[PDB]
Design a protein around this ligand. Sequence first.
Ligand SMILES: Nc1ncnc2c1ncn2[C@@H]1O[C@H](COP(=O)(O)OP(=O)(O)OP(=O)(O)O)[C@@H](O)[C@H]1O
Ligand SMILES: Nc1ncnc2c1ncn2[C@@H]1O[C@H](COP(=O)(O)OP(=O)(O)OP(=O)(O)O)[C@@H](O)[C@H]1O
Ligand SMILES: Nc1ncnc2c1ncn2[C@@H]1O[C@H](COP(=O)(O)OP(=O)(O)OP(=O)(O)O)[C@@H](O)[C@H]1O
Ligand SMILES: Nc1ncnc2c1ncn2[C@@H]1O[C@H](COP(=O)(O)OP(=O)(O)OP(=O)(O)O)[C@@H](O)[C@H]1O
Lengths: 520, 520, 154
Amino acid sequence: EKMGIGGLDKEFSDIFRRAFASRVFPPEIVEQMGCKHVKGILLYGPPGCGKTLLARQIGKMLNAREPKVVNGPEILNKYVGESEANIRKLFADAEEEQRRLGANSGLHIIIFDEIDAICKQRGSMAGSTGVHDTVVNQLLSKIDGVEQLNNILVIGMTNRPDLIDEALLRPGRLEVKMEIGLPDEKGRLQILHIHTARMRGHQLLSADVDIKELAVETKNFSGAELEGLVRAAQSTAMNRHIKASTKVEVDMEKAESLQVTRGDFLASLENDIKPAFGTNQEDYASYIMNGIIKWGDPVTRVLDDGELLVQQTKNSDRTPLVSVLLEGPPHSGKTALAAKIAEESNFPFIKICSPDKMIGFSETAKCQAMKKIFDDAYKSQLSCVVVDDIERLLDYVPIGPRFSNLVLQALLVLLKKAPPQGRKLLIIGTTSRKDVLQEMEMLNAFSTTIHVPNIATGEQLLEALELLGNFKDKERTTIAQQVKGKKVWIGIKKLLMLIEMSLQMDPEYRVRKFLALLRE
Amino acid sequence: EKMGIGGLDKEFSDIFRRAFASRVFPPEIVEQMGCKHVKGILLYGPPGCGKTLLARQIGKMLNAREPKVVNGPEILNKYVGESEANIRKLFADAEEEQRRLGANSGLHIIIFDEIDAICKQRGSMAGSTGVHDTVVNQLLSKIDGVEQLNNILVIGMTNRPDLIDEALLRPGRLEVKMEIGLPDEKGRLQILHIHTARMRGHQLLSADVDIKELAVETKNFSGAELEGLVRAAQSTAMNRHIKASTKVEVDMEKAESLQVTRGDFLASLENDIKPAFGTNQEDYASYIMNGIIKWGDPVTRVLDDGELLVQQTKNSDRTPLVSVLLEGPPHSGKTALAAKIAEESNFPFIKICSPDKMIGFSETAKCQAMKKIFDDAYKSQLSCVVVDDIERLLDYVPIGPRFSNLVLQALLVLLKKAPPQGRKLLIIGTTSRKDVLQEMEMLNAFSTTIHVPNIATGEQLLEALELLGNFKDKERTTIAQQVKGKKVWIGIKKLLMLIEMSLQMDPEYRVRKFLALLRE
Amino acid sequence: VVNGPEILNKYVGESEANIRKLFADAEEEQRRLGANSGLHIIIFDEIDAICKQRGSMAGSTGVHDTVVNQLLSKIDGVEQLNNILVIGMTNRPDLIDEALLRPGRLEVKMEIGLPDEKGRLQILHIHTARMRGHQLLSADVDIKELAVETKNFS
Ligand SMILES: Nc1ncnc2c1ncn2[C@@H]1O[C@H](COP(=O)(O)OP(=O)(O)OP(=O)(O)O)[C@@H](O)[C@H]1O
Ligand SMILES: Nc1ncnc2c1ncn2[C@@H]1O[C@H](COP(=O)(O)OP(=O)(O)OP(=O)(O)O)[C@@H](O)[C@H]1O
Ligand SMILES: Nc1ncnc2c1ncn2[C@@H]1O[C@H](COP(=O)(O)OP(=O)(O)OP(=O)(O)O)[C@@H](O)[C@H]1O
Ligand SMILES: Nc1ncnc2c1ncn2[C@@H]1O[C@H](COP(=O)(O)OP(=O)(O)OP(=O)(O)O)[C@@H](O)[C@H]1O
């Protein structure tokens, strides 16, 4: 339509309505029904969603010919007297054109590129005691008394929503707050196409660049983050050409200037991996280090009961909140199977609330960083949160026994706190202690419990060793002469610890080392 | 008398007692018998509450005939000395009538627009030394020393009640409390009829539009949002007059002028959602999530004994404080039926002291969020407070057992502390652990307990399933023919867990899976 | 007259300077004539809030450890060797500092108890003497009779 803004179909049409459609188009109801038009728009959002790119381009749709972009703290850099002077010379050229020509253009655009630098009045009623609050209210006195019944438009944008005072967020001052969030899958295919427009019209690069395949593999990150995939991608194609021949500098147009491949993109999201946030992108290989093998027949019967219950989250309307529990012996593979079921849902918000990121926190800050994860799962539609390793969030120890009662009573409630209306949430829990959770009345809160047992037979013990591929078939036959006819019971995380302790010995001594360690 | 304004019907005597009631009758014995005057009224309220149309009338209460308006920020643009002389443009306006005639109604009230801008008083003196507070030390002299024989009333008005000056709280200065609430039903529809008369189109708008059709859906917010409600709707007319016609590039008068349809206000409360406020009931549907089916006689036993007790709260003399406790097994509908008894009571103040809004709070913050609820129940005449899930407020866990004593003592008092005379308070409690609340000496404090049991028979089980409507009669016969003459004992919330998990399965194995679930 | 809790309302720095401000206005009146007025009266409206010293060492990491100073060693050492008079008053009189009740500093008590019914008669005669300058308003309002149904208050 214009210089590209993608994934804001429901939002660029929203600022069509409130400011753009009135005061210019019809104009008969404007001149019949004497109207007050809106004064400007406040732009919420995480960094990287084109808040500037609207205001860089909203002064470039009707070609109003007067854009006025001021910077954030650009006013304040004078001393007293002249501090107030810049905003009353900023509105002045549009206030002067409120003339005997009172209507009819009508100088529109006034842009504060980050307005919370000036307009705080945050509620703690402080901060230099008002060199800014003499240009906060001087800004407010310029729009009401004297009235600007005009075409002016004060588009100020920000990142912190609440810290601008609501006396400036009243409808006479500024009403239209607009949450400009990170785009979805449909939003990201709109926005890969813009930066890959000129390269699409460059040489038909390699035809394996599928922006639908790049929409799904890039699942979280926003617009400016998504441009940074491209600026590394076409830069990767340069050092495909400018350093393979010579060093700094020599080579210049030696290979008939080359093409952006799919192999450049997949290396461009190995570097950079980081979406920033990192919501749904933890790179959970730290939680699943050695894959998910089907060592036992119950293993499929664990992770199907996940997706037999994931469909309850996707489809239902009776039960909007699902709280499952993956229990069992320790080292049995509960955290690993919790990440796989959380991955196979393909939800748009998959967060692993896990105590490996919460160490050293006091009894209180574990409640806040569990509140924060269970806030950002309410701000979606489908979301799975793995409340991992219950007896570490509860920081339990069986001497006494002691545990944080502040966290437990912030965790018995979040298993029953439903999300807002129409929204869904899946809670996967892992514990090695069912009987401890039976005392604290948490099995009452969890909906159903999935048992993850250890290995049960020697036939499961051989099959657990088959798929890993660490012993020879004659060595497995020696184990089959041993572990068949015996009772074995050991976890799978421990069973990876045993094999790596056994492979460090001499080849005549590895099997007898493994039989000693398995004996416990 | 009054200009169509109400809400504070107990306050319309207060102006006719102390402040406005004096300075008329002798007026030359006021100095012979030293009745000290009052110099000002201070007005509280939210942003957009509307005070000026009352402030021009509060001088017309006295027939003042010179209410002049000084603004908050507009006096604060000029420098020091000049600003203190421009307040002497409007205080020596009333001091020239402090003439050799020292009586007979010297010149009248000066209107403020914003004491939030003028009076701040942090105690800061770091950067323009608080130039906002440098006009008031001259302006506190203009009311006292040198005092006035005028009948002025300094009408202080703010949108934030914190930064009214605590050094101005002197009985000779402005000293009396005056909260002004939201506009009521008649106050909102008349000002809707003010705006729709000028924005008429034909009469008010196009058809299917009425100010009471809006009053039955817009009953929440303040006045400035209500001007922005129509201002969004005449912009939703620009959704209709031009955007429902075609795109940006609309023609000249071919839509037949196509003004506001129904809704254009339903959308204005949903895209975007504009309550901004604060404070109304939210949400008795968030706790009654799947409705209240009536699976037999124990559902009836809850509702009749509740409302006979609601008749006790409304129509008593001996019992100003009625405290009832609901009980039973967990997952048995205790939270919902307490909300059902309160919502049918039609009391004005029905708020829910709930644990799921207090997660992560300390022991002190659970006692000040509970007093803040019970203080606002001491202000209305009839009020029912649902105090849900006592043992999560008491953050109880039966290991040790550890519970916050400080909440228990902020709760054992409030089940015995009556409100002041004429105002009644109903308190409903829910608990899963009945006898634990007995051991804390709290069934001592409740007046009565109304039992909420589980479902008992298959006839009551199927009645809970006939009202939900989820199964085929051949399956419902099979569900009947298994538990026919057998005993089942499970909660109703758990019944929603088992049935919804059974819906996800394949119909060859749905009922047999449900028959394995109902076994426990 | 300076208020009690008004002297503390700042951060660190000004609540030690305000207790010098109300003496430097007296110290600058110690002019070339060292005696002879001698700017006398300093009213603490509540000295209890300054020399609080409750033991819990709270209150802005011990601001009540740092605002006793210009009450202690500004009147004494170096002395304003005058006839000045720091007239303090309080409502929680036991928890004032022991270093303040020294014969160089504020040294002697004044127990103003709540008044007797003779003393309540004397104060009612004062604020009805202006009522007597109206018309006396009843010809039977007797302040001795009104002093019967006030037994305790001030
Ligand atoms: N939705 C988008 N579509 C295309 N490009 C974008 C988009 N969002 C950001 N960009 C890129 O990012 C740059 C500006 O980003 P953006 O406006 O999001 O930063 P910002 O939000 O103004 O920063 P801040 O949050 O500090 O205000 C543009 O030059 C553009 O190349
Ligand atoms: N089929 C499998 N099922 C489960 N885990 C597996 C499987 N195959 C490999 N693993 C390994 O299990 C490891 C993680 O196990 P997990 O972290 O659940 O143990 P845990 O029960 O959390 O330990 P603890 O009881 O000490 O908390 C992963 O590193 C993964 O490599
Ligand atoms: N429930 C109510 N109780 C008392 N007064 C009410 C109520 N509802 C409305 N009012 C009156 O409505 C008026 C609001 O009028 P309006 O919004 O048109 O202008 P305003 O906001 O007062 O003016 P300004 O914008 O200058 O403050 C108030 O002054 C108030 O007196
Ligand atoms: N007859 C009924 N009475 C009350 N609630 C019912 C009934 N039938 C179904 N329900 C449903 O049961 C659901 C759970 O109700 P509720 O939260 O009151 O259970 P609860 O026993 O109080 O749980 P908890 O004790 O853990 O708070 C509600 O969504 C409600 O719609």
